[PDB]
Every structure is written in structure tokens, then in C-alpha cells.
Design a protein around this ligand. Structure first.
Ligand SMILES: Cc1cc(N2CC[C@@](C#N)(C3(C)CC3)C2=O)cc(C(=O)NCc2cc(F)cc(-c3cnn(C)c3)c2)n1
Ligand SMILES: Cc1cc(N2CC[C@@](C#N)(C3(C)CC3)C2=O)cc(C(=O)NCc2cc(F)cc(-c3cnn(C)c3)c2)n1
Ligand SMILES: O=C(C[C@H]1NCCC[C@@H]1O)Cn1cnc2ccccc2c1=O
Ligand SMILES: O=C(C[C@H]1NCCC[C@@H]1O)Cn1cnc2ccccc2c1=O
Ligand SMILES: [Cl-]
Ligand SMILES: [Cl-]
Ligand SMILES: [Cl-]
Ligand SMILES: [Cl-]
Lengths: 485, 485
């Protein structure tokens, strides 16, 4: 089974083929829900371990809160909430909702647990699934009605400490995407219209999908401030004895990250998995001629596997006799294994192995003694090259503009725009409406809204007197806009 | 905050105090659901890592299937199923159920995935929560409306291979309880009346709670046979080309395990956590006289912590100046930390530390150079002693009987009974009914049913011609009975 849709032509069909034929997902009779098979789930387990280890260093501890929230507590978005109303065919006295997020589940407990400044900071995380029942068309990994995530929630005695935590977690999400998944992301702050309404400031990491020109939010970290503390009466006492509101954060990231990884590195042959998260980094394929000492070849493959595992390289031998090497090459290319090692009688006679890298197809002849250090070096080169090429595509996908006239041409090249902006929220909604209308007109001519993605932390120079690209009022900051998921 | 209820007098109040005052659980406004705070959740993470590592050696892979099942697929117990019927206030075309278990979610996929004998065995596991909405009174950890678990599901070409896997998983559950949690359990097969009706044979590990005399199922491993394969049309082709049904297993274990651990080792002071799963194995408490070189004492505590962590000992220093040592001693005793290390000026002058073990209160004076190996030895002694004392209580809690006349006296001593049994299912239900009725009579005289717990793998000798303790017919095997959760 090969991927036959080309990534640059029918991107949606390519994506479906890549994730189905690699055995990452399976469909399900309830629309908008997908089965995560082991090939994808192993990658989730790897980024989960990374993130857990990092937040444990910060003093965050895992926990588990109930999946249900009482009507009263939830209603302290609404068409997205799935409601449990009966046990069997008996009606519940009050209906209960499945968590779309757990603020209203956790914060009553926080109010009970926090009494003194000595109780702070309080730092909790949980890994679980949440449910958001939208009637729109789903996309595997990217927009689904049930998804796995982690959500962290912290409380602090001061706004500055909470803010520092918000930025520390955002840096962890940058590392999740860029270090683990080799996906470049842009740190920024959401516009007033796009931020979490329950909070003070929402920070984000944003990724870019060149094939459809869309930005996609990769993860989020909110400075909640004291808003939820007032609503849930979460207060603490200073050492003088006065009661003060806590300052809160919340943050999350989902299996969307896997989809972004898939879209970023995949090619016409299928998946390409970054070595740092590949469950199989090296697949060993013995050549099995009928007229050969097959036992010797297999024994050497086993020895090489042991030698590589001593360097913590994750190895699988595909010694199935009933498939050709060509079949196996394709099979593990579709699944995205970053390195394949081939060993036949001539290699054994020379004391070498043939190694082929998945991203470029370049082949190497490596001595057995050099194999472990050379493969470690090659995997680091593959990881870095995947990231650097994606980063070049990201920066080639952003157009710096000064006037609204440049917007629609840039959108039609499937690019984002970086533009000086007045940051008035009313203007963002005017811009969404107008770019949607222009996109519809174009659609009819062909036989869509542009919104803010983020106000980037990394601000280009802003010349004095620069005007907003849409209102002509004084610009405040450079803002990243585009079509979006 | 101290535990004030005595374990041997008001066991239910003791249990509640132990798990609340140690900060393991928090209550919730939806009855039958509880919050798992980090002190308990860390123990879950530890047994999860153990079990994951062990099943990965068996070729089992983790996955994630949806939490929802369509009405049609579920109804292929019923008053326990929670039904989602509305998104917002809009009605679903067909209601969907929250998983009480995932056979009906997973096996349609299995039928799609399995085509050839080369596809077998198929071995999958998932970690998730499930929901069983009983209107009866809940018990934290032991019987709750939502609980965390793992469920494994495998498919094999032959019954013998599946059966071998059933027993391998049951041995893993024995290790989960006995090796990790120091809880002794009895392997056995469930009676025909008590087994999973969807399967062929159900094996179990059973634990015993002496304070209320109750047996409790600890984990389960089912030989499903071909029953579900017929129902879901899961078939494979041999190399000759004929289609055959797969032979399946399923198995699971829940956070009930934590409650069993708590009940087994706890004492009047609170929790006692086995060192192998304790998140803090050693708490270091500096003595902080006002008239002392506090910096030197704290610096030595830090050095000792580093030295112990190099032996992979999990250490916390409680250097809070605003609590007395006596307060701290109680605080970490309630939470069950197995070792406390005390260090003050006299200890520093002697080059030793004072170490107190939680299970017995015995104190030791240990040189700094001996600290790591001696504490490793002490933790192994604590783990083994917790297990051996629990095992002695288990065997003292079982009475071997020959006649039904011995049942009610043994139940009144809060014991289980091991009795020769004819294994006729009708007789088990007669025994349940009669022992319930006798228990009610006794209750009224004081101002309850006994069922089979398991047919143990370890069978005592059965003399020729032994009769069933209840029917007088020829006995088949020794069966373990008792009151139960
Ligand atoms: C996996 C996932 C991930 C995310 N998000 C949101 C932000 C975030 C990031 N960063 C989080 C949660 C981490 C902070 C993330 O990952 C959102 C959704 C989702 O909104 N699901 C419902 C749904 C189902 C569905 F069938 C269709 C749609 C749908 C179709 N068109 N439109 C416009 C919607 C939506 N799902
Ligand atoms: C945590 C957990 C664990 C378990 N089990 C079952 C077997 C098993 C083992 N081994 C598994 C699942 C691993 C195979 C286990 O752990 C069962 C329940 C439960 O049945 N919950 C519903 C409920 C809620 C409730 F408020 C009250 C009751 C209730 C009150 N009186 N009676 C008679 C029932 C029941 N809960
Ligand atoms: O979930 C959040 C805020 C943060 N919660 C913690 C983890 C990170 C996350 O962005 C925003 N949101 C999103 N979607 C909904 C749908 C229905 C009901 C509530 C919500 C709702 O509140
Ligand atoms: O869940 C099982 C069988 C096994 N499933 C896999 C993990 C181990 C587990 O014992 C039995 N059961 C128990 N309780 C229910 C309540 C409502 C609906 C179905 C059920 C139901 O089927
Ligand atoms: Cl939001
Ligand atoms: Cl969100
Ligand atoms: Cl059952
Ligand atoms: Cl069950």
C-alpha cells in the first residue's frame, strides 16, 4: 500500500492517505471521533513523557479530576457541551456535562485548598480527554469532537509570579513543537477578540501549514489574573492576615500536535517522523536470497540491533521472509521510520551496512564499528534538517505588508501577513468580515476569513509614525494574520 | 491534623480520615466521583509505569479509543450506562453512551484489522476512565461511578495461546499487588455464576479486608474464547486459506488497587505506603534550634539528599521553620512516608543521622557513609515486612470448613471460608440467599450475602469421596467464599 495523492496537489486526500495507510488512525461510527492506533499513540506517549518531566522540574504535580460537571457549576461554547441526562432509561435529577475543560471542576477545590500564602503556589496538571461537540466537519488530529490533552492550572500570590509561569510553560510548548516534533512555531499574544474571555492575557504558539496557507494554534498559556479567583472565591492570607485574591494561570496542548507534525514533515511517499519521537528510529531489513547463509545474515542483524540499543537507538528488525525488500522499504517509508539499515551477503563480506535516510533518500555505507556514533550523528542531522527546512518554509510563508491592498494577493499565495496594527478589536472583526466577503467573490470567479493569529513576541522594527494597515490610525504593534483553523 | 478514628473500631471513619487528612482525595458535588490529588495520583503513576513496562515486553501496545459508543453498537448493566442525549440543548439524532468498558468500541475495529494469521496475535491496551452509574453508596477508590483503569484486549489464532496470555497477565496483576503494593492476593477462577458472561473463563486475583471481613476483587483476566469473535465477525485466514474465528482475551485493573493498599497497611496514625511506590521514600527533617548553626544543618541535609538520590532514593527535605519537628513527624506519618531522617547539631557532631521507620517506629543511628546502602536495605525490609504481615493476616482470615454449619460462625469472625464445592451454579445462588437471610436475622439480634470469591489455583488436598459442603453431592474443588465488595 502506497500513498498516491501528491501533497502539493490534493493535500486533504494526501493527509488522509498518510495517516490511514501508516496505521496511525482508524475511523469510527460516531462522527468527529477517531481511534488512535499504536503508531500514533507511541508519539503521544513520547511528548507526554517529555512534558511531564519538564513540568515536574517546575513543581507541577499530576492529578485527576472527574469528567463530569454539574449544570450549576458549569454555568457559573454552550452548544458544544455534551450533556448526560439519563442513567439507563432513568432520568438524572439534574443533567451533568462532560468536561470541555476543567476550570469549573477544579477551582471550587482550589478555593477549599488555598487558605494561606504558605499554600502558594499551587501547581496542578492533568492528562485526560475533553469533548467539544461541534457539528462542523472534523479533521483527524486537528479538530475533533473528543481529543486527548493535558491541562495545567496554577495559582500564585502575585501577578508577576503567575506571568512568569505563563511564559515558562509557553517555552515548554515551544520545546514540545520545535525540539521534539521539529515544527517551528511563533510565540505571541492573542488579540483582545481572540483571547480566552475568562482571562487577562492569552499567549500562544502558532504554526503554519503551507499547503493550504493556514495558521493553526499549536498550544496556549493564559494569564488568568484574578478573574476566576473572584468568581470562585479563591483567596489567601498574607502574614499580616489580610485576604487577597490568587493570581491564576491555565495552559494546554493536545494531540493536534501530532497532526501538525505529520503535515509539516510528510512527503509524497507518506509520513516522515522526527527521530526524537520515532518509536522505530532504525528498521533493519535483511536481504534474504534463497541462495545465501540466511542464518548468518539474521544473526548479524540481531548483533547490530543489540549494539545500537546499547546507544539507546530504537531498532526493529523486519525479517519477514514472505515480503520482498522493496515491499518492506515502501512499508516503513509510509510509516515514516527515519533510517533504514540494509544488510545482505556483500555487506557482511565487507563488514559494513547500507543506511538510507527517509527525509532525503541519501544512502551511506557505514562500518559496523562506526554504526552507533554515525547513526546518532545522522539522526541529529535528520532532526535538525527537518526543523530547518520547515523553518525556511514558515518564513517564506509570511509576507510583511503595510497596506490592506496587499492582503488579498498575499492570501491568494497561501501566505500569512505581518502588518502594523492599531489593535482596536472592532477593526479585527471588520477585517474578518471584509476578507471573508472578498474570498467568496473569488471563489465564484474560481468555479475564508483572515483573522489575527498572534501579536508576535519578536517584533520587527516599527518606524515612527507608521499607520495601521487597515484603519490608518497610529499603529501599535506588528500583528500576524492569516486564514486559520 | 491527626487520624483519630481507630482502624480496629470504626473502620469506615478511619479510612475516610486516612485518605482525606493525607490529602489523597477530595470530595466532589457529583456523588460517587472523587478528585485524586497528587499524593494518591503519584502512586497510580508508579503502578502504571510498572504495568506498561511489563506488558510492552509481551508485545502489547497502548492505544486510545473513543469514550463514546453508539446505541446500536453497545446494545449488540444497562441501568449503569450513562447516556449523552443533547449537545447544548439540541437533541442528538441517536443517543450515545459513555464507555462502561470498551469491547463494543474496539472489536469492530479488530474485525476490520484482522484478515490473516500473519495479523495475529493482536495485543492492545489503553489507559482511560470508565463510568458505571450505580445508585448505591460509593466508597472512595473501591466502588466509584467514574474510575481510572487500564483495559487490555488481545486476539490469537488458538485458544491455547490466548489462555497462556490470560495467565501471564494474571501473574502481572499478582506482581502489581504483591510486588508493588505489598498486598497479598489469591489467584483463582470465578464460578460460572460470577464470571464475565461474555467470556469462557474468568480468572481473578482476590484480596481480603480483615476489618470488615470482606473479600474484594483486585483485578481480572478473561479468556473470552470465540464468543465475541462470532458476535463481531473477527476472523482470520490460515495459510491453507480457510477462515477461522480468533480467540480473545480481555483484562483490567483500576485505582481500586490504591484503596486496597491503603486499607492493608494503614494504622492508627494514618497511611503506611510501601517504599516501592512511595513518592517520598525518605523525608529529611532538620532540627532547627534558634541557638544553632542552622545553615550548617541545612547544608548537611542537602548533601545527604544528594547522596541518597544518587542511589535513586526519593527524598524530600521539610525545612519549614514555622512548624515544630513534632508537627512534621505527625504530618509525614499521616501521609505514610516510610522513612524519616532526623538531623540536628548532636547528629552532625557524631557524623550520624537518626532514621525512624514508619511501620514499626523503630529508630536507627546510621553513619553518613552507611546511609545509602543501609536505607536501601531498610526499605526492602519494610516492603517485605508489610507484605509478610498482610499475608499472615490473610491466612488467618480464611477458615477451611467441611459443613454449611460452620459458615455463619466463620462469617461472624469476619473470615472467609474455604470449602469443598460441587460447583453447581444453582447452589451458589441458594447459598447467597440463605446466608443473606441468616445475616438479616443476626442483624436484628444485634440491635450480608456470602458468595464465591474464586476457585483458587492452589488447591488443598481433596480426600476421595469428599462431599459438597452445601449439597452433599460429590465435591469437585475447594472454593473460597465470603462476604464481598
Ligand atoms: C483536536 C482539537 C484541538 C483544538 N484546539 C483548540 C485550541 C488548542 C490549541 N492550541 C487547545 C485546546 C490547546 C488549547 C487545540 O488544540 C480544538 C479542537 C476542536 O475545536 N474540536 C471541536 C470540533 C470538532 C469538529 F468535528 C469540528 C470542528 C470545527 C470545524 N471547523 N471549525 C471551525 C471547527 C471542531 N479539536
Ligand atoms: C472503582 C471501582 C472498581 C470496580 N471494579 C469491578 C471489578 C474490577 C476488579 N478487579 C475491574 C473493573 C478491574 C475489573 C474493579 O476494580 C467496580 C466499581 C464499580 O462497580 N463502580 C460503580 C459503583 C458506584 C457506586 F457509587 C457504588 C457502587 C456499589 C455500591 N455497592 N455495590 C454493591 C456497588 C458501584 N468501581
Ligand atoms: O478551555 C478553554 C481555556 C483553557 N482551559 C484550560 C486548558 C487550556 C484552555 O485553553 C477555553 N474553552 C474552549 N472551548 C470551550 C467549549 C465549551 C465550554 C468551555 C470552553 C472553554 O472554556
Ligand atoms: O467490563 C467488563 C469486562 C471486562 N472488560 C475489559 C476490561 C476488564 C473487564 O472485566 C464487564 N462489565 C462490567 N460492568 C459493565 C457495566 C455496564 C455495561 C457493561 C459492563 C461490562 O461489560
Ligand atoms: Cl477561548
Ligand atoms: Cl481552548
Ligand atoms: Cl462481569
Ligand atoms: Cl469488570
Amino acid at each position: 500500500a502506497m500513498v498516491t495523492a501528491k501533497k502539493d496537489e490534493n493535500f486533504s486526500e494526501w493527509y488522509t492517505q498518510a495517516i490511514v495507510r501508516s496505521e496511525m488512525i482508524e475511523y469510527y461510527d460516531i462522527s468527529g471521533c477517531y481511534i488512535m492506533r499504536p503508531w500514533a499513540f507511541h508519539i503521544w506517549e513520547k511528548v507526554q513523557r517529555f512534558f511531564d518531566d519538564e513540568i515536574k522540574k517546575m513543581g507541577v504535580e499530576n492529578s485527576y479530576f472527574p469528567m463530569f460537571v454539574s449544570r450549576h457549576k458549569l454555568e457559573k461554547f454552550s452548544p458544544e457541551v455534551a450533556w448526560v441526562t439519563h442513567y439507563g432509561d432513568s432520568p438524572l435529577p439534574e443533567k451533568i456535562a462532560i468536561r470541555p475543560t476543567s476550570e469549573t471542576i477544579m477551582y471550587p477545590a482550589y478555593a477549599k485548598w488555598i487558605r494561606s500564602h504558605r499554600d502558594l503556589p499551587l501547581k496542578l496538571n492533568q492528562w485526560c480527554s475533553v469533548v467539544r461537540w461541534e457539528f462542523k466537519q472534523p479533521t483527524p488530529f486537528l479538530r475533533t469532537r473528543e481529543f486527548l490533552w493535558q491541562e495545567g492550572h496554577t495559582a500564585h500570590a502575585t501577578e508577576e509570579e503567575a506571568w512568569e509561569l505563563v511564559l515558562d510553560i509557553l517555552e515548554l510548548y515551544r520545546r514540545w513543537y520545535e525540539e521534539c516534533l521539529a515544527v517551528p512555531v511563533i510565540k505571541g499574544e492573542k488579540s483582545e477578540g481572540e483571547k480566552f474571555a475568562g482571562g487577562k492575557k492569552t499567549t500562544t504558539v502558532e504554526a503554519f501549514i503551507p499547503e493550504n496557507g493556514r495558521g493553526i494554534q499549536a498550544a496556549t498559556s493564559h494569564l488568568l489574573g484574578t478573574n476566576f479567583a473572584k468568581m470562585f472565591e479563591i483567596e489567601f492570607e498574607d502574614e499580616e492576615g489580610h485576604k487577597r485574591l490568587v493570581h491564576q494561570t491555565s495552559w494546554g496542548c493536545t494531540t493536534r500536535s501530532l497532526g501538525v507534525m505529520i503535515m509539516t514533515h510528510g512527503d509524497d511517499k507518506g509520513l516522515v517522523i522526527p527521530p526524537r519521537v520515532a518509536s522505530v528510529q532504525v528498521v533493519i531489513i535483511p536481504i534474504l536470497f534463497k541462495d545465501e547463509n540466511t542464518g548468518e545474515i539474521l544473526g548479524k542483524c540481531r548483533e547490530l540491533k543489540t549494539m545500537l540499543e546499547k546507544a539507546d537507538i530504537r531498532v526493529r528488525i523486519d525479517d519477514r521472509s514472505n515480503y520482498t525488500p522493496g515491499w518492506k522499504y515502501n512499508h516503513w517509508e509510509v510509516k515514516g521510520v527515519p533510517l533504514r539499515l540494509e544488510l545482505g551477503p556483500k555487506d557482511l563480506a565487507k563488514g559494513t551496512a547500507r543506511v538510507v535516510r527517509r527525509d532525503t533518500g541519501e544512502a551511506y555505507q557505514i562500518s559496523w564499528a562506526d554504526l552507533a556514533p554515525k547513526l546518532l550523528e545522522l539522526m541529529e542531522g535528520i532532526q535538525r534538517s527537518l526543523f530547518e527546512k520547515a523553518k525556511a518554509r514558515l518564513h517564506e510563508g509570511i509576507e510583511k505588508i503595510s497596506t490592506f491592498d496587499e492582503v488579498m494577493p498575499a492570501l491568494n499565495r497561501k501566505h500569512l501577513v505581518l502588518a502594523p496594527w492599531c489593535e482596536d478589536p472592532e477593526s479585527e472583526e471588520q477585517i474578518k468580515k471584509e476578507t471573508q466577503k472578498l474570498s467568496e467573490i473569488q471563489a465564484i470567479e474560481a468555479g475564508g476569513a483572515m483573522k489575527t493569529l498572534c501579536i508576535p513576541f519578536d517584533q520587527p522594527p516599527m518606524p515612527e509614525g507608521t499607520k495601521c494597515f487597515y484603519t490608518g490610525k497610529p499603529a501599535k504593534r506588528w500583528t500576524l494574520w492569516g486564514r486559520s483553523y
